């Protein structure tokens, strides 16, 4: 079956440059064009361009001409997209596309590109169960994750080993630039004396990686 | 009641009049002038159809 | 350049409802392609030469038109196709795609669930007050939440986060967080969060006393 | 978005160095003059220009502009500011309104530039009471320009016609005509109450078909008011 | 030996409208070349051979004319094509290149929200005070400020800067900067910043008091 | 593809020599004149000369004659701009650009050669947001850049992670020969002592950088 | 001042396929109307308002499009279908057409059966001898007339006129006329008609000898 | 409506003056400049000159200055054109025309000015069919009207009567300086026995009218 | 003063097929304008102010142009077309006209019927013998007409005269007259006219004896 494999999320500081790569598989690699397109956080899709990795042919949308190059490298079935002078303008998912008519039938799984001098990993605080988060037995408690850049975090609870209702708020961006989200479980209220909880946060961007025990409030 | 044309124009567009002339006897004549309170991002309504 | 406008941007059906999402371009192109995508995943190939479906597409889908008007359609809305879907053309340099439809699935109205949590201490301690509240498992998404310190009506200083629709009955969670310096949070004894939505009657109010215990 | 203009009266260089006896070409179109009407309501509202003017020579201190009516008038327009030519999408055009105009009369109207026939300059014919901006003249309105008495004018009986018609607020005196080939029939009127009235104007011969004619005697207008005409038709 | 004059040197278009620019040669030349130029990138190739389009290039665009006319046209403006067009010649040596035509996205009038602030401490210890007064996103880019410093308007000793467009909202900033030394600072109280703007019925003044949070 | 890669910028004492390189590749070097074009802080463009990669031979703007000097080297694919003495007047971008018929094609991305007889790092001031502002509302903060030569600063916030609602303005050119300007972003006033605001400033030729945190001011 | 163009003139189709026509607008119009006209009656409304169905037209028939393009569609033909359609706008003084598309039918190929006839006594009379050549009920309507006098290839001294699609069996037939004075005509013996298309492997010869019965 | 009313065809002698007339209606005749334009049968547009109706104030194109005078008549609202020295060149179509900006909006109908010093009527001719001009069952035949001046002549068949392939051939000038034109009509060659073919030939300056009877040859 | 410079000066198009035909100014103006003109009748103000369409004209027709450069536009040829197109300016004294387009339609190749007529009886009894030879309803206007009396060809005693195009098939028809004194014409015997065109593959011969029936 065929794969496109892209590289991993970087954070490159505006003005250095950087080159993701898009590694094909499963196909005769110069019987298709590669194709890169952008999604920011505004979700809609831009294409950049494309490449044929046969004769090196290149088309660009101009909103991109003078600012990504696109290359191939035959012998490992790859293809590259180049950054000269990275923005802030250009953080966003970069995903690498296969057509050969004017449709695109296998995509990457996207690169995450961050134009920053710096990465911040998270405070993590309790959202501590209490009469005022129960309802029909089940209490809602939490961990608010806030003020860390650049997207994403993960958040397990009790290292994998919790079954309970889960409500995952995606991230918000603060007016300084840093997110935040609440990653909360639901929980048979009668447990919270008994059973510890223990929120599992982990930043990729700053190698980070934190448990935090939520504990119930001692006020009802 | 008016449709707006989905057109690049009505991304400057801020206000519609609207004049009635009663043709009875003697003849009435009022316009009104209808104010938009934000300007128009896209052509149509985004939950279909022409504003 | 060649502009896709994508109609309705937004939209829900009911399970089993008929679905119809157009594509206009600005410009006549020989073809018209659609692609699916779920949140955090890739977009995938859903129809192809504006009426073939891509290997995995389920037959409710088919697409349709010609020249500059081209539209998909469901069948019958099943929950698994609630996703943003794109339409996409390149009769003509530069490839473009249009502006997307996001298609959510339609449900009985059910009302909120409302929970407030106040500030840890751990987060004082470092100058700040974060007042949360939750409204679990509710459909439309359409809420209002407003905040009242000491019976005061709040403004400008809260951010609302909105889940995705639930995989199992679709409803929606949202949490209010109000944000206020140490200082503000520890002169005002009432936090209350105040919940409008159609599933209820009345609008529900969920409070705490700071300095309780 | 532009520098401004403020504008006063000054004297004229004499009216020999506008109306030439040459053509100037056509499409020196610098200079633009219209007619409106000032006042937005529909009472005697004044009747004036609109002359616009578009400014390659770089940097200006005042636009002169002469009006001639055949009266001889000119304006000295000094700008504000300066901008060392067209910052907005536009050329860059100004406007002044004033000169109220008279009824029928030939305008001649030149414009240079200071420190600068002229190749700016344009000229026009103003109309009568009929026009839809100068009908709005207090002279006009004041003959019955604005008058609309909607005559309708049946024929009753062999020597009967009857005319119905709606009075004007400026007077109380109508003579209703009729005519084919002859007058036929006349009656003169008295009415004081703004409605639509009716009125039996007997005739001599045949009137289907012939021309009602409504006289009003307004006092402003002794006789020559601007009259009313339609027809007799048959009734319903 | 042949130069190229441009004209306008500046215009701002409506979404939707047409758009012509000139390109006036001093004598006769055998093609005429346009490049597109966006603030703080290189000059690209749009249209050369006086009417062949780059690839990528909308075909909006067109370009025509012979002997020492020419014209680059816009069949109906969009935002994305707010840049600074040059047309080049290369029938004579030197090549050169017009002066530019710099075409500017149009959009509702906007009013600047108007901010003022104080000089800091840690300038005024060095013996001169900044005062600077913020004008943010407004449209069009025409505006008045003026400093008042105790009723007395100042002259001479400040100056302005504005943004090019946003690219988003087509918007500008303006800032408008009053020096002083420390002491002429010291002396007066009441440091004003009246604004002027079509956008406003009525001028706008933001105020501080020296010393005063 | 075809890229043309031009060396970084550069500092010269005032009537110094300095020499850019422009790197081409992805075609025949010999096959196409390159051509070295100029951009003022006015904006227009200047051609300065070309020159045929294939013998050397050259042709310049007269304007410009005995102040530069166009070579290549055939080996390493490079064109060279030499100044032999560069003064105020000839500070400004530097591009050079390939030819085919009577257009440039391929732009290099611009080299700024800066005439300098010192260098001078900026003071970096606070614009504290104002405490009379309005209930919600919207509150502006900012930093000032002042006395710096020669451009350019750069300035992000928040270590680049705060983009959104912010305006750094051109420079200045005040009266003393220095520069100066402001970078200023607006924020809710609630989040004035919620959030923190840091400008980084950067000013490369002088080495200097300065992070500077923005506060209201404080009251008493 | 709208000019509306249609796409494609004249075209033809299988029963069951699909058809596509296309209406063009020189610029921006707020509604196309479709008319069907076949051959001796008054044009009928067909699709109005850009996609409505005039009461009982099929519902195999659809309209499409905005701005300046626009659609009729035929999901499936249908022999009925034969016919002219005009595309029509009111949005702009002067009221315009389209120019037509004219759609017949597409059947196998089927070779002409040949006929000639020599003139009539009656005819020679006069002076004149029309010698008649009669293709009748073939298919595709392309076919090439060559006549032959003693075996001398003749030209300029011959009209053709062919049928509309006959109502039954949608075929075609053609007349070709060869007119001679009545002394050239009494000079030759053998008259031939040689017949070309498409359902014949070798071309068809019919001929006479003047004066044979 | 606006409608620019012209005099009727003129034939002069050279050397008399005639005086063309241009009669407006439907608009103010004062606001309007009056053009007047000759077309030889070159078909070339010549502009003449132009004048202002409100004071008489003309321009002329200067190969027609004190040739041709412009003139008004406010009264009667009409401009007049009049060559007060004709010359054998100044036989043409005159136009006149409204312009308001540089463009002419309305056109007046014409007139055709013919200076001939002398006139000649033609002789008319048959030209009788035969075999010789019979093919696929058409008969030519026609009338040879020959060295006639000035121009024009007027050919008809049958008087108006005649449904059939008509060929009037422009007029040629012969090196006599006296015009020859053949008027040719197709039939059918089976009606050459029982109709008849009439041509009428008018020739207004000469006041002469001819009708020709066209029959077929036949040996003694 | 500004001479305008047409090109092409005469032309043929095809109906539906796009035309353009360019006007070159000698300096610049501010305005091009255009007018059709049929044979026999007035011009038509047709394209004013470069690019508007004067009221009536079918928006197939387009002016655009700046300086010195102007040129006009038929998006697709129709019939009535057929005509002489002049530019016009009136920027500069003395208002000039151009020097015209004549606008024809092409059509398919169709051979000349070729006829010829000996003098009558009634020009020879006069002095004078014109033979006249016939060429009907041919295209294109090219042909060649050679005179032979006793098989000597014939120079600078003929005349041609050329139809405008039919309004029906769009042909040219000609007529050549040789003209001889009644001396030459009695003293040969043979009068051919040999007419060379496309349409025909072999130039075609028309003769007579002087004296046959
Ligand atoms: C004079 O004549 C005119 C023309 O005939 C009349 O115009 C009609 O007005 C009514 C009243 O507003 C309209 O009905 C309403 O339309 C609303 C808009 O719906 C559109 O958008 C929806 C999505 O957006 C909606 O929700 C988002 C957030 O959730 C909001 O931003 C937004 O404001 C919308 O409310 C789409 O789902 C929908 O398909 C439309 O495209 C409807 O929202 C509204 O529903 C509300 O009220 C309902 C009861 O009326 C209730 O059942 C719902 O739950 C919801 O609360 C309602 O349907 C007509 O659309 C409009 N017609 C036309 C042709 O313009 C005008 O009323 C009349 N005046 C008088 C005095 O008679
Ligand atoms: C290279 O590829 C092309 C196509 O890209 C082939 O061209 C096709 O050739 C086949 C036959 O070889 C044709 O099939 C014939 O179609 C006829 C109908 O013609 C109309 O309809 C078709 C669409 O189906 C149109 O393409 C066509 O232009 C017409 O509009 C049938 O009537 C044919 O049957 C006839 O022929 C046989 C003998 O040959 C008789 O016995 C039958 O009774 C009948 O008379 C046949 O079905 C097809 O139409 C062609 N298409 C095109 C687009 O040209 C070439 O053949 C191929 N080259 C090689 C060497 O194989
Ligand atoms: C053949 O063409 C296809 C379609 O354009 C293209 O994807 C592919 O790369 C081409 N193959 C080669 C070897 O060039
Ligand atoms: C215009 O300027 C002149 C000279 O400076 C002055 O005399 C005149 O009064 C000014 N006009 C107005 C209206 O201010
Ligand atoms: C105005 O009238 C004058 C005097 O007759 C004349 O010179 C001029 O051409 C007229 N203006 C225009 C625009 O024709
Ligand atoms: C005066 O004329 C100009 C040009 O048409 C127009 O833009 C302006 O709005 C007019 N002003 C008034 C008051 O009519
Ligand atoms: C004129 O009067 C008649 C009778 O009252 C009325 O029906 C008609 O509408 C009137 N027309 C106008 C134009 O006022
Ligand atoms: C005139 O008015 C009278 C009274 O209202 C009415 O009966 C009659 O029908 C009217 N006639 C006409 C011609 O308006």
Same sequence: chains 1, 6, 8.
């Avoid at chain 1, 979700?43 to 990504?68: C, H, M, R, V």
């Avoid at chain 1, 059973?195 to 409030?217: G, L, R, W």
């Avoid at chain 2, 300007?39 to 279909?48: E, I, L, Y």
């Avoid at chain 3, 751990?122 to 939750?134: D, F, I, P, R």
Wanted: overall charge positive; charged content about 15%; glycine content about 8%.
């Amino acid at each position: 079956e065929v794969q496109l494999q892209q590289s991993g999320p970087e954070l490159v500081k505006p003005g250095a440059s950087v080159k993701i790569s898009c590694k094909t598989s499963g196909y005769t690699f110069t019987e298709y064009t590669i194709h890169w397109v952008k999604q920011n956080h505004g979700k809609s899709l831009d294409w950049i361009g494309g490449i044929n990795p046969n004769n090196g042919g290149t088309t660009y949308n101009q909103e991109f001409k003078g600012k990504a190059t696109l290359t191939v490298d035959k012998s490992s079935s790859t293809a590259y997209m180049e950054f000269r002078s990275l923005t802030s303008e250009d953080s966003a998912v970069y995903y690498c596309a296969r057509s050969y008519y004017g449709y695109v039938d296998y995509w990457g799984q996207g690169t995450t590109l961050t134009a920053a001098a710096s990465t911040k990993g998270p405070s993590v605080f309790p959202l501590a169960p209490s009469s005022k988060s129960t309802s029909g037995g089940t209490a809602a408690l939490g961990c608010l994750v806030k003020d860390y850049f650049p997207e994403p975090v993960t958040v397990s609870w009790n290292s994998g080993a919790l079954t309970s209702g889960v409500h995952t708020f995606p991230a918000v961006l603060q007016s300084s630039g840093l997110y935040s989200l609440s990653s909360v479980v639901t929980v048979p209220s009668s447990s919270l004396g008994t059973q510890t909880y223990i929120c599992n946060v982990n930043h990729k961007p700053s190698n980070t990686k934190v448990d935090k025990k939520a504990e119930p409030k001692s006020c009802d | 009641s008016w449709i707006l044309r989905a057109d690049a124009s009505i991304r400057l567009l801020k206000a519609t009049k609207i004049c009635v002339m009663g043709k009875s006897h003697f003849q009435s004549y009022s316009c009104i002038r209808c104010n938009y309170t934000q300007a128009f991002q896209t052509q149509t309504r985004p939950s279909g159809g022409k504003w | 350049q060649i502009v896709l406008t994508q109609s309705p941007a937004i939209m829900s059906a009911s399970p089993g409802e008929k679905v119809t999402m157009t594509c206009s371009a600005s410009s006549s192109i020989y073809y018209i392609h659609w692609y699916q995508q779920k949140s955090g995943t890739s977009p995938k190939r859903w129809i192809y030469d504006t009426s073939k479906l891509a290997s995995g597409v389920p037959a409710r889908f088919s697409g349709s038109g010609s020249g500059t008007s081209y539209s998909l359609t469901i069948s019958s809305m099943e929950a698994e196709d609630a996703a943003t879907y794109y339409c996409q053309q390149w009769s003509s340099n530069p490839f473009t795609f249009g502006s997307g439809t996001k298609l959510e699935i339609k449900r009985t109205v059910a009302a909120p669930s409302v929970f407030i949590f106040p500030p840890s201490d751990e987060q004082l301690k470092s100058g700040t007050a974060s007042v949360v509240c939750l409204l679990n498992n509710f459909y439309p998404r359409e809420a209002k939440v407003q905040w009242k310190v000491d019976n005061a009506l709040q403004s400008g200083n809260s951010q609302e986060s909105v889940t995705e629709q639930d995989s199992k009955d679709s409803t929606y969670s949202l949490s209010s967080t109000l944000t206020l310096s140490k200082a503000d949070y520890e002169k005002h004894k009432v936090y209350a969060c105040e919940v409008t939505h159609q599933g209820l009657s009345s609008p529900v109010t969920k409070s705490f006393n700071r300095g309780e215990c | 978005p532009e520098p401004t203009i403020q504008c006063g009266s000054e004297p004229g260089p004499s009216p020999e160095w506008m109306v030439r006896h040459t053509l100037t070409p056509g499409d020196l179109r610098d200079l633009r003059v219209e007619t409106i009407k000032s006042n937005v309501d529909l009472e005697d509202s004044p009747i004036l220009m609109n002359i616009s003017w578009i400014l390659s020579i770089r940097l200006l201190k005042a636009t002169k502009i002469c009006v001639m009516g055949k009266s001889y008038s000119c304006i000295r327009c000094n700008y504000t500011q300066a901008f060392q030519t067209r910052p907005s999408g536009g050329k860059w055009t100004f406007s002044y309104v004033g000169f109220p105009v008279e009824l029928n009369t030939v305008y001649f109207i030149g414009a240079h530039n200071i420190p600068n026939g002229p190749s700016m300059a344009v000229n026009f014919t103003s109309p009568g009471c009929l026009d839809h901006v100068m009908k709005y003249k207090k002279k006009c309105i004041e003959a019955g320009s604005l008058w609309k008495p909607n005559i309708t004018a049946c024929k009753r009986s062999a020597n009967t016609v009857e005319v119905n018609f709606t009075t004007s607020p400026l007077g109380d005196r109508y003579m209703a005509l009729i005519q084919s080939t002859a007058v036929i029939g006349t009656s003169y009127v008295s009415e004081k109450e703004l409605t639509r009235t009716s009125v039996v104007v007997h005739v001599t011969g045949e009137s289907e078909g012939a021309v009602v004619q409504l006289t009003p005697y307004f006092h402003t207008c002794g006789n020559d008011c601007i009259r009313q005409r339609g027809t007799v038709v048959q009734c319903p």
